[PDB]
């Protein structure tokens, strides 16, 4: 119904630039104020900035840690919100989400003054796009089966090894399988690369197929690996 979808996240060199996009749908975009917020690995949410609606001036406000380097703009004709990031620093690394703000409607009462009245708020979010500010290069993961060993229920899975940067996404049987699925937070190896595992519990072996669908957007790598015993 009501949704925001951000894209543009990826690896960028320190001192570089990157532009994020946020596409809205299901509501009158031009009527609302919008924000950009970010969350660094294992840290709290941090507000990046806001942009007012055209009717309220279309002006911007920025957090002191980004003002001067980051620029927020909107294109009401495309229902798109932008975040232009320049002079990127390693500390700018985080998952960036767009959110809505003080929504405003213009109504004319039988008399004259057509009021512009406001409502709340910071309602619609995410899912966020990942921005990595680092020197090191990209690397897709190697996917290995964690086969259903005999050593009631059985556990099987996929090992997603040595990738960079975060994140990777794992689904099973194109998302048809969610029950008994546990995808673990990635661990950071001595090598400087990440690795994670996704495992599923099941009764039935041989009757059905189990395929993990791994996606590493940063390196444009997609892997479908069937796990057989």
């Amino acid at each position: 119904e009501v949704q925001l979808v951000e894209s543009g996240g990826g690896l960028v060199k320190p001192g570089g630039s990157l532009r994020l996009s946020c596409a809205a749908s299901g509501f009158t975009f031009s009527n609302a104020w919008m924000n950009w917020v970010r969350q660094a690995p294992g840290k709290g949410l941090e507000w990046v900035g806001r942009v007012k609606s055209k009717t309220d001036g279309g002006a911007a406000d920025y957090a002191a840690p980004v003002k001067g380097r980051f620029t927020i703009s909107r294109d009401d004709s495309k229902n798109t919100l932008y975040l232009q990031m320049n002079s990127l620093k390693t500390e700018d690394t985080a998952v960036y989400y767009c959110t809505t703000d003080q929504l405003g409607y213009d109504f004319w009462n039988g008399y004259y003054t057509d009021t512009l009245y406001y409502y709340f708020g910071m309602d619609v979010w995410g899912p966020g796009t990942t921005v990595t500010v680092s020197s090191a290069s990209t690397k897709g993961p190697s996917v290995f089966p964690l086969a259903p060993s005999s050593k009631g229920t059985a556990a099987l899975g996929c090992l997603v090894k040595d990738y960079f940067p975060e994140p990777v996404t794992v689904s099973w049987n194109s998302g048809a399988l969610t029950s008994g699925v546990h995808t673990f937070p990635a661990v950071l190896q001595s090598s400087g690369l990440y690795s994670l595992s996704s495992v599923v519990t099941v009764p039935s072996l041989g009757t059905q197929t189990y395929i993990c669908n791994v996606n590493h957007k940063p390196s444009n790598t997609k892997v479908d690996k069937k796990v057989e015993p």
Binding site: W125, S142, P145, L159, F184, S197
Partner: protein, 217 residues
Amino acid sequence: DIVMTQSPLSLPVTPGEPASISCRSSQPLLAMDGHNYLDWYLQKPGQSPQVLIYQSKWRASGVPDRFSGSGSGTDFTLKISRVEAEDVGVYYCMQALQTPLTFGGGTKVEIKRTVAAPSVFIFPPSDEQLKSGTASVVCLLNNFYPREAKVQWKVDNALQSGNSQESVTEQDSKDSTYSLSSTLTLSKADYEKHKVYACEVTHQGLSSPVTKSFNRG
């Protein structure tokens, strides 16, 4: 800038019990529209933050009535009257009164629950893995409580250190358990020199520590 503080950062709660989160601002969030400007968010594992309470005391659409906000000026409180398993995650207070908009440091709600023993699984590296010169042996501890577990590796009955890594999942939205994966990484050669691979788990769930091994070089 207005500083927002939450207390405590970590909150363990028994299902069905009440729970409170404190939020203080360094300056007051004046009801100049006639409303005090403070929000409360819940971030649940795997998902973006979600609005619960806005305008200091208003529930958003679909927010269950067990959540309620209160307080005035500089002093606010999120209350959950009877805590549920699905309430786990991180809670944030955010003032939307005057920019920069600021968030509290966040509060992690932990569901308290009875001891549950881990199911233990072991997976040898695949032929594919080995064909590339590396060996990862995965031990899986599934659906246990509390979080605290000790996972030991024994290779031909010798205890290993510094060559394995653990990864724990977040609390279950339904059974309020976690699962752990300890992966042990050896070279292709190193895995062929030995044939016994066991992971010894020392949970509160299990009395005698459980071991599960496989024989292959």
